[PDB]
């Protein structure tokens, strides 16, 4: 007894212990290898003659 004197007439939802995930098995099972590798990002270089201008003269492959 001697109850909780409150000030806010507004009764908000009382902050509580939001527990985190501790799942009994991995959903994915095997972590997937990198979607987008080094080699998989950059495919072919270019041979359009006006790129080979830009390579040699501008220093941009």
């Amino acid at each position: 007894k001697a109850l909780k004197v409150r000030t806010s007439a507004s009764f908000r939802l009382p902050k509580t212990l939001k527990l985190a995930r501790s799942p009994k098995y991995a959903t994915k099972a095997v972590p997937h290898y990198n979607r987008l590798d080094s080699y998989k990002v950059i495919e072919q270089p270019i041979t359009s003659e006006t790129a080979m201008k830009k390579v040699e003269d501008g220093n941009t492959l």
């Binding site: 109850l3 909780k4 004197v5 409150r6 000030t7 806010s8 007439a9 507004s10 009764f11």
Partner: protein
């Protein structure tokens, strides 16, 4: 004692922001609280019948 300045606060409607009194009475309770209170009342305000009644009058 000297530098400590007496200064009344004064809560006469249009003077000085009213201080945090207990507003327990005036809370917007959640629906379930509102039910289980008002269910109690509603029982009692009703003329209840005797075949219940006797469970109020307990040991």
């Amino acid at each position: 004692n000297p530098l400590t300045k007496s200064s009344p606060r004064n809560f006469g409607i249009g003077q000085a922001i009213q201080p945090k009194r207990n507003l327990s009475r005036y809370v917007k309770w959640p629906e379930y609280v509102r039910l289980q209170r008002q269910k109690k009342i509603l029982s009692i305000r009703l003329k209840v019948p005797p075949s219940i009644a006797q469970f109020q009058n307990t040991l």
